[PDB]
Structure formats: structure tokens, C-alpha cells
Amino acid sequence: QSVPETQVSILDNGLRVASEQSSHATCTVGVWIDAGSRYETEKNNGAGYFLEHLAFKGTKNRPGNALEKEVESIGAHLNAYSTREHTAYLIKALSKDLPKVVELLADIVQNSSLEDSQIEKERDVILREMQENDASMQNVVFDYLHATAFQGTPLAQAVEGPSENVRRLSRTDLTDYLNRHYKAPRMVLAAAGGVEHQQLLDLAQKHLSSVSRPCRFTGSEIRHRDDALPLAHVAIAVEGPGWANPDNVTLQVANAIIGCQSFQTFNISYSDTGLLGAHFVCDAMSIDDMVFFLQGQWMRLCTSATESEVTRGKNILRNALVSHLDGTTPVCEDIGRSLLTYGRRIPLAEWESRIQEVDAQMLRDICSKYFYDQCPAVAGYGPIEQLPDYNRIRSGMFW
Amino acid sequence: TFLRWASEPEHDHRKRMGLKMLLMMGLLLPLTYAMKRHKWSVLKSRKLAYRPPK
């Protein structure tokens, strides 16, 4: 595969600058930060989201629309996102523009300016959208599959936070989150595409060299009944192994075996925890039959796998998790997480080796370890009266 | 005592059955109740909340 290895050179502050040169002419230079809603302490539950809104509204060097203007003029796309564990600010731009794609990113992580005036507006923006964020039923289901599964922990609370905090937030608080969770050893400068690693390392030395230097799963159930909705969304999960756990790969193959309606499957991983399960949307009348169907399948893998199907699963995984030339953005993203989670970029050859070592016996062993006789977390929203209660799903978790 | 004996040749035996019976129910009831309380705890802990969209 002649994979372009990801050369990662570290910095004094610890930016762990990394890179994976590629022929593509445009590149994606991003900053990842190990800071999410898991690091918030319920008094600043929307600080990362609201800082993610404020981060493009001007820094000392780029007051007002300067930031957006320049990153617009250069012709680059500026994006940012926040999860429960990671925050990313990345720019897709013509490689030659690295010089500015990097200096701009430096401002966004440090020297940022949180104009109180702007703060006011972003508050309104976040709040109002949240007032409508309820339209994204799936996100709702998935932010309760989190609340009821991680009750009492910082992993239950959402990325956006409760409207309460959103309204009650001030520059100083933000400043704290910014000055507390934006440390240089918890930061990765990732570059993918037409970039040279030595030039990127010199730019990180020139700019960004200033950056300062028991989660538990609770088998439970939340049922939001609202019978006026046309469709019902139900998510059932168990405790995922984690990000670093080796068995994650044998679980991905299991998901590739499974693949009523919109019956997706997810393996969300956080630092030594996670949610492994399925989300499906169905007319109310069929919710119970779906559930029965789904539980039977998990059970099928646990006791009755087949090399053929495993193969089907290994192959789909193989065509997946490539993140290679899939594009600068995706690749950079993967590197961004790989340096934050694993501490290194796992190459695709190692992924292929870990895929080909998976057989049917260890797949049903790992599935029995993680699915069989486990207490799930259930989150339902919509006409969910025929959704079975916890004893029936409890009993369907075993044969 | 004898006339009693004839009227119930199993006075003793019935009483042996009653002893073991007591013991058996004595172990089954508490346990069954416990289970009754496992499978009913789920509901007995259910917390309902009304959230009109308001």
C-alpha cells in the first residue's frame, strides 16, 4: 500500500505537531485539543460550545470579521467541532497557504478575543438554536442514551449544555475554560495532504510555540413519551470497551455483521468507556418487533457466528477505516484523533493485521463478553408505548 | 390416645409433612418475594417527570 507514514514531530510546549504528506494540492491543517464536555464541572457546561462559537469572531490581531475575511480571501474553508472529549479547529486550504493556515490557527487557539458584545449574540444564537435543536430527534435520543447511561458522571451532560448555563456565562468563565483546557501538551497540530513536515514544524516553532504548558456506565432507561410525533427513535447500548481497548476491532466486525427501519449501529468510544449499540426509528406499532429482531441478532453473533459472515464483516470494515486519500479533511481528522486518543497514528497496515487476525471464535467470545447478559441503556422518543420496559429488554439480552 | 390413634392413623406422619412443608415454604416464600421485588424494583424506582414544552 506504500502508505505515507505519519511523521509526527513534537514541540517544547508539546503541540506534538504531526503530518502526512500527500499529493493532493490542497491540505487540511487542524488543531485538536483534549477538551470537551467531560472536562466540564456542571458550572461551565456550555463553555466549550460557546467558545467554539466565539473563536471565529475576531482576535486581537483579527478584530471583527478579519479572521473570517482573510480565511475567506485565501479561499479556505474554516470549520470547528466539539465532542464530549475533543475539540477541533481545522482549515482546508491550498497547501501553499500553510504559512497563513497556521498563523491563523495560532490566533484561534491563543490570543483569541472574546468580545463581550459578541458573547451576547452567540449566547442568543446558541440558545435559540437549542430551542430548535429539539428538532433533531436523533441527537436528542443520543444525548439521553448518554444521560441515562452515564448518570451522575460528567459524561451524561451534553456538549451544548443546559440553556441555564448558556444564559449564565461570562467572559471570565470562558477565559478560564480557555486558559485551563487549552494546554500545549494536550494539543495536536495535524496536517494532511500537500504539506512538508519540516516546513510545518518550523511554522509551529514560529507560531503556536507560546501555548502554555471514575466514568461509569449505569444500566438504566429514559423514556420521553410524546405521542404527536410521527416516528419513534430508540437507542439501546451497552458499555463499549474504550478507545484503546484492542477488542474494539472485533466489535467493529460485529457491527459490520449487523450493518425495521434506519437500523444503524454505533460504537462510540471515550477514554476507557463507550456506548456500543443500535439506534432505530420505527412506527410505534413495530417498535417491539424491531427490538425482538435486534436482540436476536446480537445473540446470533454471540453463539452462532459464521466465518462467511465474519468475512463479510471484515471486508466492509476493510473498505472502511481507510482514511487514506479519502481526502485531506478526513485523514487529518483521523490523525487529529489518533494523536489525542492513542498517542500515535495507527497505520492502515496495522489495522489490516488486526482485522485479519479476527476469526469467528474470538468474535463470539468478545460479543459474549460485551453483549450477553448485560444491562443496557435504553432511550426512546416518540410514540413509544409499545416499546417494551426494562424487564423484557432485560430478558431479551439472553437466551 | 388410642381411640385418637384409630381416628387418624397418620397424626404423626401428617405432622412430619407439616414440618418439612413449613421449612420448604419458609425458604421459598422469602426468595420468591425477593424476586417479586427484583422484577418490581424497576418500576418502583421509575421516576416520572412532566416536561411540557412551554
Could you say which residues from 368 to 397 on chain A have a Cβ atom under 8 Å away from some Cβ of chain B?
A: 389-391
* Residues A162, A5: Cα–Cα separation, whole Å: 42
What count of CB pairs under 8 Å joins A to B?
7
Length of chain B measured in residues: 54
Contacts of residue A229, defined as CB under 8 A and 6 or more positions apart, other chains included, come to: A137, A381, A382, A383
Residues of A in contact with B38 (CB under 8 A): none
In this structure, how many other beta carbons lie within 10 angstroms of the beta carbon of residue A360? 18
DSSP reduced 3-state for A81: strand
Mark residue A220 as left, alpha or beta (left: phi above 0; alpha: psi -120 to 50; beta: remaining).
Answer: beta
In this structure, how many other beta carbons lie within 10 angstroms of the beta carbon of residue A215? 16
Chain B contact probe: residue of A389, A390, A397 with most B CBs at under 10 A = A390
- Enumerate the H helices of A208-359 as residue ranges: 248-258, 287-303, 307-319, 328-341, 348-356
Which chain A residue is nearest to residue B49, measuring alpha carbons?
Answer: A224
**A390 and B42: CB-CB below 8 Å?**
yes
Residues of B in contact with A224 (CB under 8 A): 51
Quick one: which H or E segment has residue B46?
A: none
Among the partner-chain residues B42, B51, B53, the one whose CB lies closest to the CB of A389 is B42
Give the type of residue at A357: E
* Catalytic residue, candidates A52, A122, A221, A333: A52
| Buried-state track B21-54, b at ≥16 Cβ within 10 A, e below 16 | eeeeeeeeeeeeeeeeeeeeeeeeeeeeeeeeee
